[PDB]
Amino acid sequence: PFDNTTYKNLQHHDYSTYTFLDLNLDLSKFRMPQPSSGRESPRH
Amino acid sequence: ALFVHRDTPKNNPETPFDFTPENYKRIEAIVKNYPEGHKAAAVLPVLDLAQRQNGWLPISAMNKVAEILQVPPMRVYEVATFYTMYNRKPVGKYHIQVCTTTPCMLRNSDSILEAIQKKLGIKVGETTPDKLFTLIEVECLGACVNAPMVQINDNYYEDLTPKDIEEIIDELKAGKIPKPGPRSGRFSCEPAGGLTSLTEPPKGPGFGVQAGL
Amino acid sequence: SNLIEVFVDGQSVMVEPGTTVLQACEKVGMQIPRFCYHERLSVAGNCRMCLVEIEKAPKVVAACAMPVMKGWNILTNSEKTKKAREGVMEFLLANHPLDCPICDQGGECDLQDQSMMFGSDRSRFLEGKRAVEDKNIGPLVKTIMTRCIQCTRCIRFASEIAGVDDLGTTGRGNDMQVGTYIEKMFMSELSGNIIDICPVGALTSKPYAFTARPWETRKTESIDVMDAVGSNIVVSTRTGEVMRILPRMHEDINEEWISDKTR
Amino acid sequence: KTSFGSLKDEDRIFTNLYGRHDWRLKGAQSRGDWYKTKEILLKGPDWILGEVKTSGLRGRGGAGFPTGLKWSFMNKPSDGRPKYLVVNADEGEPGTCKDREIIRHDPHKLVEGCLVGGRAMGARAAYIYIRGEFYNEASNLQVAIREAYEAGLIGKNACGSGYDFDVFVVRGAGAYICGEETALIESIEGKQGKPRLKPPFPADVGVFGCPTTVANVETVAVSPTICRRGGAWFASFGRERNSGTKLFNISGHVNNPCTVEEEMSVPLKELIEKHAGGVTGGWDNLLAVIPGGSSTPLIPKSVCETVLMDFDALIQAQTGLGTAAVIVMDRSTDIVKAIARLIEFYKHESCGQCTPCREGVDWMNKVMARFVRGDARPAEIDSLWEISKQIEGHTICALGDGAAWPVQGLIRHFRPELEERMQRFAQQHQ
Ligand SMILES: NC(=O)C1=CN([C@@H]2O[C@H](COP(=O)(O)OP(=O)(O)OC[C@H]3O[C@@H](n4cnc5c(N)ncnc54)[C@H](O)[C@@H]3O)[C@@H](O)[C@H]2O)C=CC1
Ligand SMILES: Cc1cc2nc3c(=O)[nH]c(=O)nc-3n(C[C@H](O)[C@H](O)[C@H](O)COP(=O)(O)O)c2cc1C
Ligand code: SF4
Ligand code: SF4
Ligand code: SF4
Ligand code: FES
Ligand code: FES
Ligand SMILES: [K+]
DSSP: OOOOSSOOOOGGGGOOTTHHHHHHHHHTTSSOOOOBOSSSSTTO | OOSSOOOBTTBSTTSOOOOOHHHHHHHHHHHTTSOBTOGGGGHHHHHHHHHHHHSSOOTTHHHHHHHHTTOOTHHHHHHHHHSSSSOSSOOOSEEEEEEOSHHHHTTTHHHHHHHHHHHHSOOTTOBOTTSSEEEEEESOOSOOTTOSOEEETTEEEBSOOHHHHHHHHHHHHTSOOOOSSBSSSOSSSSOTTSOSSOOSOOOOTTTTOOSOO | OOOEEEEETTEEEEEOTTOBHHHHHHTTTOOOOOSSOOTTSOOOOOSOTTEEEETTOSSOEETTTOBOOTTOEEETTSHHHHHHHHHHHHHHTTSOOSOTTTOTTTTSOHHHHHHHHHSOSSOOOOSOOOOOOOOOOOSSEEEOGGGOOOOOHHHHIIIIISOOOOOEEESOGGGOEEEOSSSOOOOOTTTTHHHHHOSSTTEEETTTTTTOOGGGOEEEEEEOOSSTTOOEEEEEEETTEEEEEEEOOOTTTSTTOOOTTTO | OOOOOOOOGGGOSOOSOSSOSOOSHHHHHTTTTTSSHHHHHHTOHHHHHHHHHHHTOBOTTTTOOBHHHHHGGGOSOOOSSOOEEEEEEOOOOTTOOHHHHHHHHOHHHHHHHHHHHHHHTTOSEEEEEEOTTOHHHHHHHHHHHHHHHHTTSSBTTGGGSSOOBEEEEEEOOSOGGGGSHHHHHHHHTTSOOOOOOSSSOTTTSOGGGSOEEEEEHHHHHTHHHHHHHOHHHHHTSEETTEESEEEEEEEESBSSOEEEEEETTOBHHHHHHHHSOOBTTOGGGEEEEEBTBTTSOOEETTTTTTOBSSHHHHHHTTSOOTTOEEEEEETTOOHHHHHHHHHHHHHHSOOOOSHHHHHHHHHHHHHHHHHHHTOSOTHHHHHHHHHHHHHTTSSSSTHHHHHHHHHHHHHHHHHHHHHHHHHHHHHHOO
8 A cells, every 4th residue: 555654764773884885895796897097006 | 183193002003903804805895996096096985994893093094004005104194184084083982973063053952962961971072981972063964954963973863852862872871772863753854744745646657758768 | 380379468479288377477477476386296276376367257267277278368467366366375374473583484485575576565364373283204304384384395296206105284174284194204315305395484404494594695506416417506605604505407407406415 | 937836746856755655676666767767878878968958957066057068078989088977975065965865765866867877978887975974875875776786777788778887886084075076086086085176177087087077966866857757847847047846955943844845946935934834933033044055145034035946046146046955044043153153164174275265264263253252343344254255266166165155145134233243242341
């Protein structure tokens, strides 16, 4: 049924201090190979 | 409060800091978000990861982040002194941040700041002697319609009265964690006397999609 | 040729593409004031003393960093250019300490000289000034950081020409402090040239400190012999005694730098 | 059309603004998101730029630059360097909390907007520079980005269109100036958030040296709705050169402080008395309104009766629209204390790079802190006016402008109250 009274965004009550970084570690496999500037750093 | 560093026995380049191995995997994931040749772009997330590991930044996390990213250490010192989240001093376990800009001051954030002060016995900037609470006074946290509000390490505690923030500090002293939200009847940002908008059901897919698409 | 035509106070001048407003005004013999700009360092654009009016443009441009567009009339002596200069000199002198007699840069100070040439003649600052903690960067460069105007010629020299990357700005806002953030000793082979390019008395020569004063020195133009570079120097002397050694500009040798041994 | 506002729920772009529906992928698809995205990507960059230019969409960051004209600066062939969309999600403006609600409650709308916008400009990926204080919101956005990668909606072969597009979230670290686009670009690069000078613009030299567009959350998230519903639908709202819908953040001294989407050229009085429950103590209790966040100058109660909440009507009210974050101040307010706290914000949030902001914003804070007590003489109001004019226009970015402007609005509309503050200080302390 349709509902408009309950707050559906309850997932952030159970985020720890490493939630963002574990999600980035999970997402690191879904991504394209990064572009290269041809050098390792501008001091190279 | 000082933007120079002096070597103390608790904070020196021989203070032991090192990342945990799963933090090394998270640093690898951070560095693989940026182009080859600009590994120096990962200074802010890896230094924030060092702070989330250690609680604050001694000047061995700054040097380790400078080493594992191959950037000069002064360019990590600049970032750590520029941004206000990086704790260059060891803060308490619950680092309370009371917002006292104009939209929160208009809704009496001074009452909550006084309530936290007479609840903890400390003032702005001080840490409780059991190292559980550090009270500071911050700028706009971006929760202005839920004013007055605080932040306790990750979480926004909103629409507060002094009784609400005393209850939050009580059940933080009990080892529990409170719910990060408004303390009034409302849920996130709606009007408290019912919705003035978005009361109809949403229209779903394909509603009003133009021709030629 | 692909030279574009620009105008400095209406005078036509043909400049290369990529020329900044300051260089286009330099080609007609006008020197725009500056504190952070230095023609051998990268462009900072963070003192706003070079703010000049382009006509039919309701905003002053940073002449050290803005490239000239074709057909611009640069107004170097207009009224809002002068208002920009006096306002920026007012903000430069707001927190600057009253140290001109006890300062070694006195008489040879850029901040003094173009406060005389471009600033106003009095203050509206009725507040308490700031005071910056002094840094210890070695036995050569005396550091009094209250006199710092945060022009970041330090950081650009030590990052680009000295190649050290160990000076920077810590803090934020009016509390932004130039330094090493740690008790570090900036000892490069060219480390005394930040004395030269500090426009103010925030970085002076610690051996030269308190001894002389620029108007009474006799500038003799000579050669370095400490190495085989043949660095062209000014030996400034006062009453038959050698006081210090400053560089001469020679684009083919030492462009305007010398080593610490020479200095 | 002459009267604007009373926006119906069928024209709301940001449905599930309040958290009442599912924010995740199955709930976002059931409200219209990710519908025919493959067709929008296959119709090309020029079609999407034409739909944004037709819509009259101006930049929701607060400056109101035209979005299609801005994004067309990237419509150019490559020069070896990659291209990037950078989504501005800092939102450090006091009064403003709208981008928090878009990221937190409609995240897939922001991710689909990243895909459509970065398609229109040939961008390789999207860097959402979210505010660091929005940690739960950033993890919320990361869960939605993982749901979009796992469904094939972004990443390799995004939505089945053959256009590869990644989406990254970079978190800030507590600097308001890192929402300024060049300072944000420098903050992504691992440096201090100090604004670059302009030119080079980000479309020429942006993040990492690459061609870049920095765009707000709200001007990005409305773009799939603009490309689905059409530009003419979006241009059917608001006045001409003032098109669309706008999120409004009514906070301060109102009965029901809320975030609401409303039509563009809505009156201020209609917005406050409809969606916020009115001013506390009635409309006669109104003293002044800061119309669109802390950077805009305030307007007194006499201007708030008739003025419309778009860009041009607030420019004619010698203020700005800004972030459209309405700060309402009643008659019980020491307005000098509120504006001086606002300038205290602007000196705590100032990176120190150029001389006029670094020095003059601290000097305006010292003068305003004396003006709260009245520890001054009435020549210093004109002194502070000229100091604000010296800061304004002479800085690198618009935080110098944004610090000079509330001082100017306070002086312009409340000089007699400043004068009587100072003269009662002078009589009871001498
Ligand atoms: N949303 C927020 O949280 C906040 C918003 N603001 C707003 O920010 C505004 C100032 O921002 P700015 O970006 O400095 O204003 P505006 O002068 O620069 O320009 C806005 C946009 O237009 C682009 N643009 C303008 N002229 C251009 C040109 N010739 N070529 C290429 N691109 C061009 C800029 O790149 C920028 O992205 C203020 O009006 C204020 O209301 C201020 C503080 C916080
Ligand atoms: C000091 C300062 C802070 C700013 N902060 C933000 C911000 O937090 N979020 C934002 O979207 N724009 C911010 N802006 C405006 C941006 O410069 C830029 O105009 C905008 O983010 C992207 O343009 P858009 O309006 O077309 O989206 C800020 C501007 C200044 C001068
Ligand atoms: S640096 Fe210049 S203006 Fe400052 S005290 Fe020295 S001589 Fe005076
Ligand atoms: S010490 Fe001198 S050269 Fe260095 S930033 Fe300060 S004023 Fe500039
Ligand atoms: S005006 Fe202020 S915010 Fe802008 S570059 Fe200068 S110090 Fe930074
Ligand atoms: S003013 Fe306190 S959250 Fe924005
Ligand atoms: S000389 Fe151009 S700003 Fe310093
Ligand atoms: K000097």
